[PDB]
Design a protein around this ligand. Structure first.
Ligand SMILES: CC(C)(C)c1ccc(N(C(=O)c2c[nH]cn2)[C@@H](C(=O)NC2CCCC2)c2cccnc2)cc1
Ligand SMILES: CC(C)(C)c1ccc(N(C(=O)c2c[nH]cn2)[C@@H](C(=O)NC2CCCC2)c2cccnc2)cc1
Lengths: 306, 306
């Protein structure tokens, strides 16, 4: 029993974290086989983060401009190239701890684990959702850049996020492992701000199903709704519209609990309109949107507490 | 910026997890040097968990009654002994991944990371507080027994918890790594239930200091309180009394923010009496008690956002 934000075990990623220094700037990098990936802003001067030209800054560097440290061992850089907002540094040693891995680009609403690192040293792990506005609600201090986000399936690490910067509201922005930013953000100091966010409806529904699996039904009702009628309410409460594709995704959870998706939508409509009346669901006084249907299936029992 | 429940990186512990089987019962064990630690209830029959006599059950076992598997490798048991509610199985191989480690008994209100494991395979990591009633609000399914809790300081793993059982309310009970239960619980099926819990006042105060460090002061006020006057209110709201020792612990956070401890206590008194009026603190609509003063110092910047 229980239901917590649960991260993946971080050991396979810990063995990949290194420190990269260029000039006076140090940050984290990710060492897989004979390549080290890191944010390209490692080459950026202090006095000009307002308007860097990365092509012009990088052509002025040699391989020995970069210092890469794996623990207390120096890795010699033998090549370098820019890919989007990442640098790829070729090193003279293949990481003997490289796990089976893939690079994936994750979609808004999907979750991943973050290994927060400083100076190439892992410091903590936590689970995050990619918000609809393409930010994450992380916990990062100066020098956390280059920390990565990932999911693990059958001992294969799917890397999906590298941290680049903090926005004015204290939330975080970064790229996939091809160096393409999530959202409309850029790697320079500008006035950019996160856009308005929205609540991830599919995840709220998944979490209400988790509550039923774990034995709680207090918030159900005798009503149903049409998709369109629910979406009229969702707009009023800044929830994402529900689509037929999202209804289909909830099929297995609906089958395990015997609660039709549109019947759960009617329960959610009532909770939005009337509130929770001082009660809790899975220990929470608010509706939670940072668990996906997959996360619920991963964590909950496959047998409902009827 | 940000503030999350952050676990320690789990890799040093992952390399210690093994599977232990006796008869038809399988659970997790912890392999350090040439010893495997696991719950002694691994030797307990299905048809008699109501009244096991562990001395009488264990004398009927040999070394080869126990099967220990580290990944796909079998470890031969060459000795066994009971220590309180743990079994210590001596094996023929010293774990080459044994980290620097210690066993510690943690006090109520203190936090630790849990590596949830099934069949000796790590599945997830999360951060927990030891409640005043000696339970934890974990997330554990059948077969999670033997999963461990730990903290990490300068690459030394301090193991503090091994999971034994789930109580009727869905919370979890276990032992230190000497096999002594936290709380008044026993390793058999009885009517036992968690006692009434209480809110960890020292942790709430630490988290209000975290909110000031991160830049938010909305909940402060112009009042102060005496320790005794605060404790009268704490009793009404099921908060633990504040002691002078706990005031002293808050010294460094008070110094970093310039807010005297008893002045923060006055802020907390007002929040208990008046509520939060629809506002949030560090993203939360409720007062949070699962971060210790040490956790706040570990995670927050050492420079207040003034
Ligand atoms: C060069 C530029 C791309 C503009 C950049 C500058 C600073 C940082 N940041 C670092 O900490 C860092 C830089 N180099 C090594 N570390 C911090 C940051 O984004 N500050 C913002 C305010 C000014 C510019 C952006 C930070 C703090 C906490 C978490 N994540 C990042 C990142 C990017
Ligand atoms: C023998 C006894 C000590 C009574 C015991 C029995 C079952 C378990 N439990 C297991 O899963 C297990 C046993 N052996 C290997 N796994 C589960 C459990 O506590 N059920 C309770 C209801 C009946 C008895 C107690 C469990 C579920 C989820 C999380 N944690 C534990 C533990 C202890």
């Amino acid at each position: 029993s229980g239901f917590r934000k649960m991260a993946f075990p971080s050991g396979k990623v810990e063995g990949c974290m290194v420190q990269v220094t260029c000039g006076t700037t140090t940050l984290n990098g990710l060492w897989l086989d004979d390549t080290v990936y890191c944010p390209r802003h490692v080459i950026c001067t202090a006095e000009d983060m307002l308007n860097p030209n990365y092509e012009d800054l990088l052509i002025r560097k040699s391989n020995h401009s970069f210092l890469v440290q794996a623990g207390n061992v120096q890795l010699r850089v033998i090549g370098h190239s820019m890919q989007n907002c990442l640098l790829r540094l070729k090193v003279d040693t293949s990481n003997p701890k490289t796990p089976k891995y893939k690079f994936v680009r994750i979609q808004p609403g999907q979750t991943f684990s973050v290994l927060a690192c400083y100076n190439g040293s892992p410091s903590g792990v936590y689970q995050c959702a990619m918000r609809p506005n393409h930010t994450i609600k992380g916990s990062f201090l100066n020098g956390s850049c280059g920390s990565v986000g990932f999911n693990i399936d059958y001992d294969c690490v799917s890397f999906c996020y590298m941290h680049h910067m903090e926005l004015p509201t204290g939330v975080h922005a970064g790229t996939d492992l091809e160096g393409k930013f999530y959202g409309p953000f850029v790697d320079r100091q500008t006035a950019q701000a996160a856009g308005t966010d929205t609540t991830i409806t599919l995840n709220v529904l998944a979490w209400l199903y988790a509550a039923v699996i774990n034995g709680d039904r207090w918030f159900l009702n005798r009503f149903t709704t049409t998709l369109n009628d629910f979406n009229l309410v969702a707009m009023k409460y800044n929830y994402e519209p529900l689509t037929q594709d999202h209804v289909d995704i909830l099929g297995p959870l609906s089958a395990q609990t015997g609660i039709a998706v549109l019947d759960m939508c009617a329960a959610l409509k009532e909770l939005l309109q009337n509130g929770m009346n001082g009660r809790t669901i899975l220990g929470s006084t608010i509706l939670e949107d940072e668990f996906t249907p997959f996360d619920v299936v991963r964590q909950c029992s496959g047998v409902t507490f009827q």
